[PDB]
Amino acid sequence: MREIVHIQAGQCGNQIGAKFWEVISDEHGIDPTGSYHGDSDLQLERINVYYNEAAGNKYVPRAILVDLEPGTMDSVRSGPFGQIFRPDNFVFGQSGAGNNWAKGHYTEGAELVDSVLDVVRKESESCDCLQGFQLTHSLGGGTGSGMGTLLISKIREEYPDRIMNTFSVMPSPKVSDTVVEPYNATLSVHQLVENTDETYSIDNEALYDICFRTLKLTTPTYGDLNHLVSATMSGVTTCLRFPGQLNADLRKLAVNMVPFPRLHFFMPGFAPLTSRGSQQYRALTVPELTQQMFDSKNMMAACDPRHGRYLTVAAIFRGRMSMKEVDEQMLNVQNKNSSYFVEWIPNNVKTAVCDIPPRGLKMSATFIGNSTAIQELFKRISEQFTAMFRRKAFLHWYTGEGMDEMEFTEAESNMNDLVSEYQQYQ
Amino acid sequence: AECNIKVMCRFRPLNESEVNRGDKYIAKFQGEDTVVIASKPYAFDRVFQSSTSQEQVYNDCAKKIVKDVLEGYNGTIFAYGQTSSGKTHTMEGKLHDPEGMGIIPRIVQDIFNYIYSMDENLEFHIKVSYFEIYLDKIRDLLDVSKTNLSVHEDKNRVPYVKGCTERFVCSPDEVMDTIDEGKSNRHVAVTNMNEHSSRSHSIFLINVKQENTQTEQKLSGKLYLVDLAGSAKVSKTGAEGAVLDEAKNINKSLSALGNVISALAEGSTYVPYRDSKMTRILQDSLGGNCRTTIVICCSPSSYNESETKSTLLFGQRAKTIKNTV
Amino acid sequence: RECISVHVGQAGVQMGNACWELYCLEHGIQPDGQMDDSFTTFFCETGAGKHVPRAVFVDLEPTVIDEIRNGPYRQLFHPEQLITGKEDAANNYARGHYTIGKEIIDPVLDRIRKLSDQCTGLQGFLVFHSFGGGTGSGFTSLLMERLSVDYGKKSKLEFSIYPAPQVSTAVVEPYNSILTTHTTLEHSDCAFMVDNEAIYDICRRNLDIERPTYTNLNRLISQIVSSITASLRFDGALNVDLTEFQTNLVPYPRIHFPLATYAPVISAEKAYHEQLSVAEITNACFEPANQMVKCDPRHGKYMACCLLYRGDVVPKDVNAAIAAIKTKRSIQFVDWCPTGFKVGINYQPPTVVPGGDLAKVQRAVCMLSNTTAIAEAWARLDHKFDLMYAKRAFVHWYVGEGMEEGEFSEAREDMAALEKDYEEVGI
Ligand SMILES: Nc1nc2c(ncn2[C@@H]2O[C@H](COP(=O)(O)CP(=O)(O)OP(=O)(O)O)[C@@H](O)[C@H]2O)c(=O)[nH]1
Ligand SMILES: Nc1nc2c(ncn2[C@@H]2O[C@H](COP(=O)(O)OP(=O)(O)OP(=O)(O)O)[C@@H](O)[C@H]2O)c(=O)[nH]1
Ligand SMILES: Nc1ncnc2c1ncn2[C@@H]1O[C@H](COP(=O)(O)OP(=O)(O)OP(=O)(O)O)[C@@H](O)[C@H]1O
């Protein structure tokens, strides 16, 4: 019944992928060992869509952890929910890439893809009818950018008809955690633009900006940032996991948000975002959530939406709520701000609601936005790519693995192409 | 510097499936400049009637392209139409027959014949290639092992395919065996509308390179021979199973180039060639240094009267496009 | 006297579970599945002291179908009738029609045959759906085509939830509505339409419910669909059958798009203070803001209106009431059908759900009427379609299913023919 197979790549993709299984384990009432201790019967109604049943009323996640270094698996296996994962799925290499896309794509990737394609083949055969795949990686580095982008092409060859979702975190200019980031971002987007049908553009800079303004976290760690992005992955797959008044599968949101084949880079968001010291001084009905969703300082991307125009918007909701207040609020946001929405579409909002909200909250929603303001993050990395590429800097490492210099220029031709697409519809 | 796209129409006789049903002959010709359909003219360059033979079309449409592609520039000849419009009979035809042969053997026969008339100092290095598209995977015909290829960019960002078959030919008869080997392995499905239904785009590329020994001036010509498939209506054709799966793939390209050439009509900013891979290989045709000549095909039957109108408005929109030669 | 029903999409079964609970409480049918001639037209008699409805719930997505299997109304319905699929339509007219539709229609086709063969008083069919999504557009358009070639002569009463001018749940619904209407124009005998923001306005100003949900929207909609067939269930002084809605409301074989409105809609506290009679409801049903569609009836002209009352209502005041409606010059009837009034009566009154938002009323009316007021609505839907069709937006998914750009033009020119037909007929 539309089973989704999880897949991870890179260090960050294993961390946020690990946090993804943790947050959804709580609402489904899954123990860290694997047994069930929930209260509602609907949790078992669609537990098979991510997990696999087992003996003793145990449930195993349908996850495949892939990382070229072995130390990443030791941290995930030693976590709070590390033991629930299958030990056979922990496939990994020995010698890391060290932030090199050519290693994880050509040399170090070719020896491991044969070991992961047979594993996901087994998981794809275990389910009754698969819907698609969702992946977590990062454009920075070599593992998540190299290993993830490679098998995305292989999964397209093996599963060209199924949905191919991706949650890809991109770099930022002010927060730079890698010297070779624009080359990896420029080489990765050549594969993401053509292979996958959906993509969520996440930024680390906004993940720090979002925590100061509304959460008021004084000492935020990576685990706190993972809580925000993990909740976004749960909102997109809510209607098939629990019943709702209006269902919206991963395909039902893809057809509405992807108006063209190459324009599929979304922009996520989440609400209600409120600190613990100011929870009593706020309401929880629908209109305060609507204005917070479309707020510029709410999304986890560094793009200025006021500098562009939204192509389409999709706001999945959760929990019992009234439909009049939901529908009427989406009318005024597009009417009062008609300049910031394209006139060549009559309605840029996709609505959907569920009845079973997360634990600890009664009303919540997740934002999915495709907008022409995404190009400002793509040209700056392109400028960093072109600034470093024009003198052939940091290319001698990539040619040692047999990579051609023109492939960087072919990626450069793809880089200025996608930004020109959003400029056409602006 | 700037040349318009040569648009030409061709109506054919009614097939055996159409005359038995009793369709009305809606085709009405007004000279060669336009054709009338239900009191609605559509201006073109040259309209071919049902009585036009194979040799008459080649002399009128694809004759001048042999001189332009060999002069130093590029040239592209490809067709468009719905199902049962007569694209393969127009372009490929009966290869073994003298009269029924299409544009592919008539073109290559003119290259070797023209080379014999020119001087001996002009050294010609001709090389051919042939490949299909099948479930968005560029499968090669001369080699059965490889089922997919990747397109790369050259120095001036003109796209071209890598890893394809490259036979360095010397004799004209050798090309006749290559295209014959191509149709032998070409997949064909049986349907209610068409028996030999071309369910894939047959790209036949000839990188014609030439060089003079006296003046030392090297020149090349990109010669594209691409035969498009017909947009099959499932109610009329009855596509089911694997036929509908392949019918989906051909519908991508004709809709993709429809987005491109329509964007070129009003003169859009970006002109998104990249929306499909079939449109990527045709980048040089629509906006490169190629002397393009589209040849649309339409049936004179009233059963598909709406499809002919879609192809006619497709034709007149193509006349407003110009190539940057 | 029997009639088969079918529900499609998220919109279909969501009101289907809400309407059938209203049907069962009228005939004294407990939800467990048991308690002479009034219930035979919907509910069968299975052996001894057990019944089952003459309907089927079909939907590709399994979230709503299994909710009925795990819901409270489990023992009432057949376990086999709750048909479910394996792959969602996703706002695609083509995906629920060609790829996913073909591998599920064959269980659906033969089921209606055996369901009709056991029956003997089959009047017709009525389908509840919504063209505003994917499942209610493609699969609904496919099943009606395949049974029309088989049956043909039997009636077809469509019930679709169309989008509003400005409010909308989806974004691709013009493509979904424009494609499925191309097939609906030739095979649908009649199609009653309801707008999503209009029904919110019904419960806003009259029922004073500032925060309702879709469950409340289906209750008053269940009163509409149950009142049109109420004459067939119970006895009435002037009986009207299901085929009355085909001859009396369809002036031309292509113009088969009536409207719908219902009154009285009064809360519990307001019902005791507000007098209930035929005069106020007759003036209220023709009130423009009280209609279930955001289209001004003053702009158009009524071709014909079919009145149908319920409860203890004598036939004197209903004739005197419509006589006052004829004298009103604010409205305007078309010269092509001056006597466009069809009144009916049923002795059994409007029921009431325990704990429902609607209050008890001794009499009610369900007014269906055709007009050229929706001519601007089709022009509005066509106008917004031209904006996205000019940019070729959302086209790569439909052709990605198997279709092409050819029939996209066929649906456009079909609406162009449909638009001018409303303009020329309304002269
Ligand atoms: N929101 C979070 N971001 C993280 C976290 N860990 C890393 N990152 C960010 O993602 C950036 C790159 O992602 P990764 O840490 O996974 C580098 P990767 O493992 O793919 O390659 P190698 O470790 O060299 O084998 C990284 O520079 C951080 O900005 C995390 O736990 N949470
Ligand atoms: N008035 C009213 N409209 C409803 C109700 N339920 C659904 N709808 C409408 O139905 C439209 C979509 O109909 P469907 O085709 O059934 O949607 P779906 O079944 O979820 O289609 P998928 O997304 O592919 O699963 C929405 O835009 C809603 O506005 C309801 O209970 N009342
Ligand atoms: N100009 C013509 N004169 C006589 N017969 C023709 C002509 N063109 C096509 N035919 C007939 O059509 C048949 C071949 O059909 P063909 O393969 O061309 O269909 P098609 O147009 O390629 O279909 P699709 O558009 O779906 O690929 C031949 O048997 C031939 O007799």
Residue numbers in the entry:
A (entry chain R): 1 to 426
B (entry chain h): 5 to 329
C (entry chain B): 2 to 36, 52 to 443
Question: What does the published report state?
Answer:
Microtubules are cytoskeletal filaments that play various important roles in cellular processes, including intracellular transport, cell division, and establishment of cell polarity. In vertebrates, both α- and β-tubulins have multiple isotypes encoded by different genes, which are intrinsic factors in regulating microtubule functions. The GTP bound to β-tubulin at the E-site (exchangeable) is hydrolysed within the microtubule assembly proceeding via longitudinal contacts with α-tubulin, while the GTP bound to α-tubulin at the N-site (non-exchangeable) plays a structural role and is never hydrolysed. We determined the cryo-EM maps of α1A/β2A, α1C/β2A, and α4A/β2A microtubules in the dominantly populated 14-protofilament type at the resolution range of 4.2 Å to 4.4 Å.
The tubulin isotype α4A is highly expressed in various tissues, such as the heart, brain and platelets, and is mainly expressed at later stages of development. We then built the corresponding atomic model for each of the maps, including the non-seam region and the seam region. Similar analysis of the lateral interaction between α-β and β-α contacts in the seam region suggested that the α1C/β2A microtubules display a subtle longitudinally contracted divergence between α1C and α1A in the seam region; the α4A/β2A microtubules also display a slight longitudinal contraction (Cα atom RMSD of ~1 Å) between α4A and α1A in the seam region. Taken together, our data suggest that these α-tubulin isotypes do not show obvious lateral effects on their microtubule structures, while α1C/β2A and α4A/β2A microtubules exhibit slight longitudinal contraction between the interdimers in the seam region. Surprisingly, similar analysis of α1A/β2A and α4A/β2A microtubules revealed a clear contraction of α4A/β2A relative to the α1A/β2A protofilament. This contraction mainly exists between the longitudinal interdimer, consistent with that observed in the seam region. Our structural analysis revealed that, compared with α1A/β2A and α1C/β2A microtubules, α4A/β2A microtubules exhibit longitudinal contraction between tubulin interdimers, which could potentially be related to more amino acid variations between α4A and α1A relative to that between α1C and α1A.
